[PDB]
Amino acid sequence: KPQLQRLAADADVDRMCRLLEEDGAFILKGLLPFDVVESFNRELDVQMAIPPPKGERLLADKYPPHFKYVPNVATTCPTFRNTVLINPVIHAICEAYFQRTGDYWLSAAFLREIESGMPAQPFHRDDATHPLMHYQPLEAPPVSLSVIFPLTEFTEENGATEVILGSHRWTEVGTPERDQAVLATMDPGDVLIVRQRVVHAGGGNRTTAGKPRRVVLAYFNSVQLTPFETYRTMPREMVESMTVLGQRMLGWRTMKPSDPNIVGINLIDDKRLENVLQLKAADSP
């Protein structure tokens, strides 16, 4: 049975995009150094130790307690903000993937923890955040890309992400059976990359006693699509401590979709947003 391809981190980027069109997903081996994964994990150890808020939780209230949730990790985890979000390989893949649609940015990036005994996640497509994506023909420029980071090991026992190869060529999602999918068993530092429309699901932790399965989902959309999470309330000192690439990903700079849009998007007073704000950046003195 055909399995997800594993590629070296320095593999060719055009080859990777060809895998996204054929299979729909692939895995990068050893992209993140151990120290990067280790400091990201301790920053999420801090957020996970915070009790969930008393009021309304827009996503967690709509779903069963099959997972724990940390929204918008970019605002509380500097390692993601200043290192993972601007990874040079990740952006070489996005630039090749989104070349036909134009600029891209971060629509969402959150953590989910699956403790021992939790059921599987239903098979889904990430397109459901922007329902118009369902009507995009397969041959239209892609507008969505899902980048899945394992922060713990992914095994068959603890519920590694399940991907149905070639499922982006189905019209509908339907009700697939689990054995149609392939497991994305990975070590921390790997990355799972999933094309728009690819049907997938989290596995569900069957381990009797152990650390929960920990996964960070980074959702990159075309700048034509409204970000699921808005990073507009971030303190200016936090935003100005990011690089230019980082600020662009979090919606603080004016962006450019491809032609026929020859002006741009996310502007004000007919100027670039960052000029109007007079936004400093860490790599733009």
CB 161 to a copy of itself: min, Å: 20
Residue 112 as a binder of ligand AKG (CB under 6 A): the answer is yes
Measured CA to CA, the distance from residue 142 to residue 198 in angstroms comes to 12
Q: How many residues bind ligand AKG (CB under 6 A)?
A: 8
Q: What is the DSSP letter of 74?
A: G
Under rule CB under 8 A, residue 202 binds a copy of itself: no
DSSP state string for 155-220: -TTTT--EE-TTGGG-SS-----GGGSEE----BTBEEEEETT--EE------SSSPPEEEEEEEE
Using CB under 8 A, pick the residue from 254, 274, 279, 281 that binds a copy of itself: 254
Question: Binding to ligand AKG by residue 218, rule CB under 6 A?
Answer: no
Using CB under 8 A as the binding criterion, the count of chain residues that bind a copy of itself stands at: 59
Residues that bind ligand 4IL (CB under 6 A): 63, 67, 69, 108, 112, 121-122, 124-126, 128-129, 219, 228, 260-263
Does 161 bind ligand AKG (CB under 6 A)? Our answer is yes
Please, which residue, 24 or 257, has the CB nearer to a copy of itself?
A: 257
Q: Does 46 bind a copy of itself (CB under 8 A)?
A: no
Number of Cβ atoms within 10 Å of the Cβ of 63: 12
Q: Does 196 bind ligand AKG (CB under 6 A)?
A: no
Contact predicate 75/175, CB 8 Å: no
**Which positions from 74 to 93 touch a copy of itself by CB under 8 A, shown as an x/- string?**
-x------------------
Closest distance to Co ion from the beta carbon of 159 (Å): 13
d(CA 261, CA 277): 23
Q: Let me know: does 90 contact 131? Beta carbons within 8 Å.
A: no
Amino acid at 67: F
Residue 92 binds which one of Co ion, ligand AKG, a copy of itself, none, with CB within 5 to 8 A depending on kind? Answer: none
Rounded to the nearest whole angstrom, what is the least distance from the CB of residue 185 to ligand AKG in the complex?
11
Q: Is 200 one of the binding residues for ligand AKG (CB under 6 A)?
A: yes
Determine, following the binding rule CB under 5 A, whether residue 126 of this chain makes contact with Co ion: yes
For the chain, the distance separating the N- and C-terminal CA atoms, rounded to the nearest angstrom, is: 53
**Catalytic (active site) residue 219:** no
Binding status of residue 275 toward a copy of itself by CB under 8 A: yes
- Residues 6 or more apart in contact with residue 103 via CB below 8 angstroms: 222, 223, 248, 255, 256, 257
Interaction between residue 247 and ligand AKG (CB under 6 A): no
Amino acid at 236: R
Counting other chains too, the contacts that 70-73 makes at CB distance below 8 Å and 24 or more residues apart are 70/44, 70/110, 70/111, 70/112, 71/110, 71/229, 72/108, 72/109, 72/110, 72/229, 72/231, 73/44, 73/47, 73/109, 73/110, 73/111, 73/216
215 binds, among ligand 4IL, a copy of itself, ligand AKG, none (CB under 5 to 8 A by kind): ligand AKG
Q: Residue 151 carries which DSSP code?
A: S
Q: Where on the chain is the footprint of a copy of itself (CB under 8 A)?
A: 53, 55-60, 62, 69, 71-72, 75, 101-102, 128-132, 134-137, 140-141, 143, 222-233, 254, 257-273, 275-277
Query: Would you please indicate which residues are annotated as catalytic (active-site) residues?
Result: 63
Q: Where on the chain is the footprint of ligand AKG (CB under 6 A)?
A: 112, 121, 126, 161, 200, 202, 215, 217
